[PDB]
Every structure is written in C-alpha cells, then in structure tokens.
Amino acid sequence: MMYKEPFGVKVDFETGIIEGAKKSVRRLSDMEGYFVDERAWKELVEKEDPVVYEVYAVEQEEKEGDLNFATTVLYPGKVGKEFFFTKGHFHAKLDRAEVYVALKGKGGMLLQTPEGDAKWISMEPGTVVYVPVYWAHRTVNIGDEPFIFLAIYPADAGHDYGTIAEKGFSKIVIEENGEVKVVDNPRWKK
Amino acid sequence: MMYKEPFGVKVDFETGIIEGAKKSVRRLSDMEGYFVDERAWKELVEKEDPVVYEVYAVEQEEKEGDLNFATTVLYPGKVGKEFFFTKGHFHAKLDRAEVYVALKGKGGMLLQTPEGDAKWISMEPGTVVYVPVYWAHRTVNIGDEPFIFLAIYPADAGHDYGTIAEKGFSKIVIEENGEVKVVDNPRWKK
Ligand SMILES: O=C(CO)[C@@H](O)[C@H](O)[C@H](O)COP(=O)(O)O
Ligand SMILES: O=C(CO)[C@@H](O)[C@H](O)[C@H](O)COP(=O)(O)O
Ligand SMILES: [Mn+2]
Ligand SMILES: [Mn+2]
C-alpha cells in the first residue's frame, strides 16, 4: 500500500478559481436544445456566444469512498425569459448524494426525481444544499452577478447528461413581470 | 419508493453555526490523555475546563453513497505549549476520504498514516483540504481567534477515535519562543 498524499488548494470565494484544477467552459453554443426559446438562443449565440458557466474540478480516480470537488461559476443572463443554468444531470450511479456550498451571488437548485417530480431550493452565500440519491440537479443564476458554488461529490458518481438532454426538466425558472417564477416546462416530455 | 427530500440549510461563515443542526461540545476535560503536558492539562481543567471545540453536524443514516457535513468551531488556546486541537480519528471504514473547507481563522490539519507517517497542511480561509483514504486527521488552531471549517464526509465512514486515544499523533504542533512549530511527539511510540 502506497498512500495518496493529502493536499490543500486555495479556492478564491470571489472568483471560484482553483489553481491547477481541470477547467471546463460551457458556452451558449454548447447548450443547443436546452432552452425553451430556440430563436432567442440562436440570436444570442450569433451576437455574443456568451460563456454560461465555467467549472474548476479536482477529481480522483473513480473509486468507491473517494471524493471529488469542483467550483462552478455560473454567469448571469437570460435566454428569452429563462435564466442561465447548468446543463443538469443525474449521477451515472444514481445512489450517490452530493453537497453544494453557495459562495457568491444569488441562484438556486432545481431538482427532479426520475418520475419528474420537482423541487426548487433557493441559494444565497452560505446555503448548503444536500442533493439526495436519485435526484437530477441543475443550478440556476437568478441575479445580476456571477453565482459561485462548490460541489463535493463521490468520485464514482459520474454524470448522466443524456436523459436531461432529451427530456429536460419538468420545471423552468423564468423572469415574468419582474418576478422570478418556477413554472411548468411547456416542452416537458410527460 | 420514498425519496429523501432535498434541503438547504444556512451556514454562517463567520460563526460556524448551522441552523437546526446536531450540536456537540468538547471540553478540555473530555480530552484526558490527549495532550503532552498532563500537569498543564490538569491545571487548565481545574481552573476553567474550557470548551475546546463545538461541532454542528448534519448527518444521514449510515449508508454507502450518502454524505454528511458538519462545521467545527475550534477555539483558540494552548495546553502548556501545545495548541488546541480536535481529538482526531481514522474513519472506521478506512477507505473513505473527506473534504474540508476552511472558513475563518488560522489553523491547519495534521494527518497520519496507520504507520505513523505524518503531514501538516496549513489552512486559511478558502483552503480546501483533501483527506485521502487511510489517513487519521486532526485539526489545530494556531491563532488567537476561532478556527472554523466545514467538513464533508461519506455517511458510512464512521469514526475510529480509539487508535488515536491510545497512540496519539507522531507529531505535535507547539508554540516555542513565539514561533509555531511542528515537532516529534515525545510520547509517540515507534
Ligand atoms: O453536480 C456536479 C458534480 O456532480 C457539479 O460539479 C456540476 O457538474 C457542475 O455544476 C456543472 O454542471 P453540469 O454541466 O455537470 O450539470
Ligand atoms: O472529520 C470529521 C468527520 O469525519 C470532522 O467533522 C470532525 O469529526 C470534527 O472536526 C471534530 O473532530 P473529531 O473530534 O471528530 O476529531
Ligand atoms: Mn452532480
Ligand atoms: Mn473524518
């Protein structure tokens, strides 16, 4: 038995950056078919193709009992009425929980069961969200500034994007009459 | 099946307090046989029996894939030359990692393998520490203010305090001549 070396890394709570982490960038062009308003999506991709979110991940070999962590910086914006959000996923191993820690900004988490039953959890700095086993989860930025959070998750959880990519979430988070509303997705399969 | 409800809880990054969490308090009298200077321990217990640390825990039923989280508020102080620390433990399931996030104050983590090989990791706010499988871990407050951190750990990791209670750590963290030092534990056997 060799032992893995313990380590510390600095996370800047204001920027979300973790030095030496695997950085990933999701631009709007990378999210075709995720937003309700396809015409608003095409127009925004043409004009700007803005970054929707960036992820800084510190990941281990996929093995039972080990833990990954990542920050996400979710930028503010709307595609039509719909606030910017992360793609969303179930874990590849469904029976894996996750803990989120909100660091900066205003947002929330949309969760749904495999049957499409939905839950909205508000997130402000200091909110810790527990994502239980079997729940798909997507984060949403509802404010004017970046929404930054840290996720800690089992190293073997994986990501299943496919199911969400096709069917989506049963709820959408929109601005309507200057109010943030969590409403039925008109294009929800079921 | 019955799904576990997702939930959000507020963590105050300034105080470590989690709303509605299971609170535990460890006083100096709860830590007989932990500190090198037994006479200093006895004198301080008699004079004050200070609170050494408090823990606010949000725990799930012990099952693979699930996650617990907890804040600790580690108070400043010394027993003789030795800084206040947590009892320290291995996980009962040794193959379980943990992630710590430092929130306030100045401190660090002492880690040790089953063979007694040791490592110190400095923690200042924003430091995330990865505790690998098979490492015992103890946090230490090396400053004049509370050292506050959040730990996220597998719900089935459990706690093995007994090994540490009997053998201690191979290194100790002290103040000598106004300098903070990590040095060999004189009472360590090996
Ligand atoms: O939930 C996790 C990991 O299990 C987060 O680290 C997300 O992966 C990240 O916020 C990006 O979101 P997705 O693009 O993966 O939905
Ligand atoms: O590592 C963990 C849990 O696995 C921390 O939440 C500690 O339990 C806490 O800092 C108190 O310290 P101990 O008294 O448990 O050493
Ligand atoms: Mn996830
Ligand atoms: Mn632990």
The DSSP line for chain A is ---PPPEEEEB-TTT--BTT-EEEEEEGGGGTTSSS-HHHHHHHHHHT--EEEEEEEE---S-TT-EEEEEEEE---EETTEEPB---BB-SSSS--EEEEEEESSEEEEEE-TT--EEEEEE-TTEEEEE-TT-EEEEEE-SSS-EEEEEEEETT---B-HHHHHH--SEEEEEETTEEEEEE-TT---
Closest Cα in chain B, distance from residue A85 (Å):
18
Residue B93, burial from CB neighbour count under 10 angstroms (0-12, 13-18, 19+): middle
Domain B1-190 has CATH 2.60.120.10: yes
Give backbone dihedrals phi and psi of B44, rounded to 5 degrees, phi first.
-70, -40
What's the rounded Cα separation, in Å, for the pair A176 and A108? 17
- For residue B155, give the ligand nearest its CA: 2
Going by the DSSP 8-state scheme, the letter that residue B11 receives in this structure is B
A83 C-beta closer than 6 A to ligand 1: no
Measured CA to CA, the distance from residue B23 to residue B46 in angstroms comes to 24
Rounded CA-CA distance A27/A53 in Å is: 7
Kindly state the DSSP code that residue B160 receives in the 8-state scheme: B
Place of tokens 């700095």: A125
Which residue type is seen at A77?
G
Distance CA A100, CA A131 (A): 8
What is the amino acid identity at position B88?
A: G
Cα atoms in the 13 Å half-sphere on the side-chain side of B4: 19
Smallest Cα–Cα separation from A127: which of B8, B73, B125? B8
Tokens of B68: 């617990």
Cβ neighbours, 10 Å, residue B151? 20
What gap in Å lies between CA A56 and CA A18, rounded to an integer?
6
Q: Which residues contact A12 (CB under 8 A, 6 or more apart)?
A: B126
A49: left (phi over 0), alpha (psi -120 to 50) or beta: left
> Quick check: helix, strand or coil at residue B75?
coil
Token pair of A93, please? 């191993």
B39 membership: H or E segment, kind and range: helix B38-47
CA distances from A143 to A43, A78, A83, A97 (A): 22, 10, 9, 27
Indicate if the alpha-carbon torsion angle A181, A185, A186, B2 is positive or negative. Answer: negative
Q: What's the token pair of residue B22? A: 């299971």
Listed by start position, the domains of chain B span 1-190
* B interface test, pick of A14, A18, A67 with most B CB neighbours within 10 Å: A67
d(CA A7, CA A183): 43
Structure tokens that stand for B127 in this block = 């430091």
3-state secondary structure of B165: helix
The gap between the terminal CA atoms of chain B, to the nearest Å, is: 52
Q: Resolution, rounded to a tenth of an Å?
A: 1.8
C-alpha B72/C-alpha B82 separation (Å) is: 19
For A:45-104, CB contacts with B below 8 A are 58, 60, 64-67, 69, 93, 95-99, 101
